[PDB]
Amino acid sequence: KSTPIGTSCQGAMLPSITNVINLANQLHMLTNRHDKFLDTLREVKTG
Amino acid sequence: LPHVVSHVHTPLLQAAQQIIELQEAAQINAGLQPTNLGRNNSLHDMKTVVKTWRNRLPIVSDDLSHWSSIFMWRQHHYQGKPTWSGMP
Amino acid sequence: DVKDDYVFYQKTKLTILQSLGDPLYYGKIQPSNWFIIGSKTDAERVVNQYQELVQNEAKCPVKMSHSSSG
Amino acid sequence: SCKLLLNLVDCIRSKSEQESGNGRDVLMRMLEVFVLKFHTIARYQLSAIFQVTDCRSLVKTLVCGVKTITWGITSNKQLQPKETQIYIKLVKYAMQALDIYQVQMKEEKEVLEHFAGVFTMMNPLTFKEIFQTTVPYMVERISKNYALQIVANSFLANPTTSALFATILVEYLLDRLPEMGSNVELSNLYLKLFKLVFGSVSLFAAENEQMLKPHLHKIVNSSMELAQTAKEPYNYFLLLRALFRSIGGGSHDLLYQEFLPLLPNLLQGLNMLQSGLHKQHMKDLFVELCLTVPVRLSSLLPYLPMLMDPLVSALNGSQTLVSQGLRTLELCVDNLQPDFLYDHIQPVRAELMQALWRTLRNPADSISHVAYRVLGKFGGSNRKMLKESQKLHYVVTEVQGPSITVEFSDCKASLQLPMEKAIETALDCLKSANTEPYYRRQAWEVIKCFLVAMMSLEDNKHALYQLLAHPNFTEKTIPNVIISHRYKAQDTPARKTFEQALTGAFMSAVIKDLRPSALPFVASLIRHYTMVAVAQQCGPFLLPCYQVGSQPSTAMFHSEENGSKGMDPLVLIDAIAICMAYEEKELCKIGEVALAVIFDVASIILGSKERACQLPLFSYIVERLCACCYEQAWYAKLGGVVSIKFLMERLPLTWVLQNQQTFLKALLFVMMDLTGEVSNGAVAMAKTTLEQLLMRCATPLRAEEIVAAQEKSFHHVTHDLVREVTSPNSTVRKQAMHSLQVLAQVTGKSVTVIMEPHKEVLQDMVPPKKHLLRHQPANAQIGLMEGNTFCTTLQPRLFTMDLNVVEHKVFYTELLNLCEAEDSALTKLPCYKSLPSLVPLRIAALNALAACNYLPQSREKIIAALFKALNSTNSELQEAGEACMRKFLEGATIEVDQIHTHMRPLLMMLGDYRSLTLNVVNRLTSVTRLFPNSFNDKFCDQMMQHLRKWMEVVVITHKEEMKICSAIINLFHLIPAAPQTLVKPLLEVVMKTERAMLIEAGSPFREPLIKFLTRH
């Protein structure tokens, strides 16, 4: 009950934003809001 | 029984006809009572029962054992009518 | 052309009509609607069923009268 | 004071019977004071508001006095009209007085009982006169005061009132019957009055069966044809059930013989309504209306097969419908010689036998026992070989669904458990009706944790900033890539499950007690879905399927053999389409918010709104949203219309011009598939959206590209709009004609200029080419006739028609040969067989005769045909004949000799008694409306003798007819140059009739007379 949830089905995984790199003002505030949202969304466990 | 209908469900549906006929034939003895004999209650209902038994018929795919069971049971009440008219 | 009428407190009639041109029967119950009827054998089955139904839940009349025209 | 006057009335009565004096004026003098007392306490009570107790005591005391004074007067005799006006003022003021009881039972019902019984012992002739005049005021008072139902149901304790007041009540309701379905509380209250009046006829079988015998077709028929195009037709179907329980099971005699000629067209209608996918409880209502008909087993054999489809539906889950379905089936099994029944049950034998087999497992002793008895009644027909075998469950593919890796503390082993069924169960729980919110939160947690854990978490604050700040985002042009679902091969077993999870998240974000904890979460995910999508299909980091020259091929989607490298961000649009296509319209608000959020994110990180419109994602959005308008359901079409409206009003105009043709086609298919029963008000919204689209796109302006795009879209749109000019469907044809008028109104151009470059479409369509008017169905015949009428109605004439040049003789003579055969006996044709009316077919040809009036070489035939229609017997046919006569009135001239020779029969039957019927009077007043010079003073003098004869007959036959004498006087209003010396004699006989009948309150001989009187 203290480990992050992982899935072994990488074929159904939704790719990240950076995944396109390996396959080769308001903007700054929007980035901060998403970074904060991802920070609090990382702490999801299987408990 | 299994959800789908197959040969295993035949005996229950095959014996359902004779189960209600036992209740239907239970009124034969009530209508033959001498207290209420000869009235229209024991005359119109008797004809309806006879006509109802004459109409319905099972399918020929059934075994001859069930055909006999229905017919001799019907014959038992059919032969009971001359028993009280024989002693206008 | 075969026109057969049937007379049965209430008074409802059954009519059988056949138009010239095709052997297809038609029916109408009068207490421009038309009924679809097949061959001759289907005609009496409807008539016998209709006669049986009307004979039961009246109980005041007892009779049977019919005629033909054509 | 009223208490003392309560017992003082008998003293006046006792002294009045001793000697013949004057006591009638005294008794009516206080009555007017009491009437004025009602006004004083009712007018000032609104501004005034112990008080309440005193007010109700005064009302109760005065009402008892009113009942007492009426008791001594009546205890009949005919009442003078003057005091009937006082009673009109009394009843009008009494309703306003009955308002103190609202702010504060047992005594409330008692006092209303005394008030309702005042008019029971009154003269029935004057009783119906006052209530008919003041029937709309009483209905309006009920709309504001809900306590009048106590008075309403007290009208049937045991009076003779319900036998007469109900006739006026039903006539008023039938007059405003089409009003039902628009409002909410007005329709329900009208339905409540229908239930109460149907309760009275059902409870009292005497002198109520005769009242319901006439005007019964309108209740049965007009309810059906008005529920097709309405907003809430649920009230119409609630009214038909009440009638069924009253026309049968109780009052049965002359009502059974009247409902028989309606079963053909009614039973064949309910069969079509129950085959739809409208709602869940609506279908249960349809199968209840189709079954339990107030008709015995006889006179039902020809229509027996039409009661089998509802029987199957009633035996498919509903608790009450299965019990009723078994009862209906048992009644047929009882006395039907089941060999006859087996013949008519064969088409639905497989479905019915399976339904009966499955109804033996429910935990109920009142259903399984009945079903087992019914099955035992069949001889051997319950086990015969079924031609269709039972359906089986199979798995199409062999793959692995989503799983969660859970590790243990023993032997270092991980476990992967599937949760494909868990998401489906969570969706069912969120879609359930009676579930506690605790399990809803748990179901929402399952969706939330699965959705978060499925996606990856990377690029924290470093890679996201570099990608968004990279160049070639606002400079490089976006390549034109079209994304379509037409190339989709097959839905993978995982895509459907992931789609269901998204729909649950959207549905959980709108339900209350979970909305505040889900809106930021859902909105943030949608932002994440868009940013990952735009990072994949952009310029600098385009995938090989997103090249300048690319294809919409299967590699775009996530599939087995040709995938998109795993879970492309394209399922969000699919979830939006499904939620907008839900049976509940509460998901449209969140649907448009999500669309606004998607565009808001794209417009920020791209620089401009017009550049975001070129991004390939919006190409898939419109195709997905316009595909919801092709489903057979009506709620799905509404979701597409809302999506069309939102994308039209928000996203700029330059985008709309490119996709205007696609939007027009989607908005046009909705009005075509919905013909029999349309919707709960969907085509009205579709017409408004189409009208708004035309005004926005055709609005004149200013760059060269916008003008070129506007005219390019104009050419493509107008080409499609001339295609349905001769369409067989009347709904699209009328919309297309109205489409052209509004299009020319917005722009600074005429109508014919628009249709100049597209004449080649209509050259060989609006005229008959290689076809005849007898080999085609009447649906196409009407459309072609209306097309010619619209083609030759503008003052600029297109497709000029001249007889003896080319092919204009066969078409002309065909429509002349249509206005001769009247009865259906002479028109016994295979094509003209299913035409119950045949009236609208003659109307379209009749309008064509009046449309062409520029050919003077042949006018005798058209004039004779026009006068033949005016001399017809039908009312609707004659009214339209007057309409085209008025349309033809703008011709060159109408000679008097033509009129004299065409109205010869009317003068021939003028000198007869049994010839001046309603139809003839309607014909006579119609022909005198136009050409206001056809008669003289001698004809007026003769008509004065006729009305004297008419008014002498009524006064004898009284102790239908009221309308004809009201119409004959109304004819004098239309005719000009009537003699001035006839005014006195006509008003003298009117008073004589008003003195013999003793009626003064709004006589039918008053409304046309006052208009007739004011000329001189």
Write the layout of secondary structure elements.
This is part of a larger assembly, with three copies of chain A and one copy of chain C (70 residues).
Chain A: H1 19-22, H2 26-41
Chain C: E1 4-7, E2 13-18, E3 25-30, E4 35-37, H1 40-56, E5 65-68
Antiparallel strand pairs in C: 1-2, 1-5, 2-3, 3-4
How would you portray this structure in words?
This is part of a larger assembly, with 3 copies of chain A and 1 copy of chain C (70 residues). Chain A has 47 residues and is an all-alpha fold. Chain A is built from 2 helices and no strands. Chain A has helices at 19-22, 26-41. Chain C is an alpha+beta fold. Chain C has 1 helix and 5 strands, in the order ββββαβ. Chain C has a 5-stranded antiparallel sheet. Chain C starts with a strand and ends with a strand. Classes of the chains: A mainly alpha (47), C alpha+beta (70). The A-D interface holds A 3-18, 20-21, 23-24, 26-27, 30-31, 34-35, 37-39, 41-42, 44, 46 and D 400, 402-407, 416, 449, 452-461, 463-465, 467-469, 494, 498, 524, 527-528, 531-532, 535-536, 541, 543, 563, 565-567, 569, 604-605.
Task: State the gist of this model.
The structure is cut from a larger assembly and holds 3 copies of chain A and 1 copy of chain C (70 residues). Chain A has 47 residues and is mostly helical.
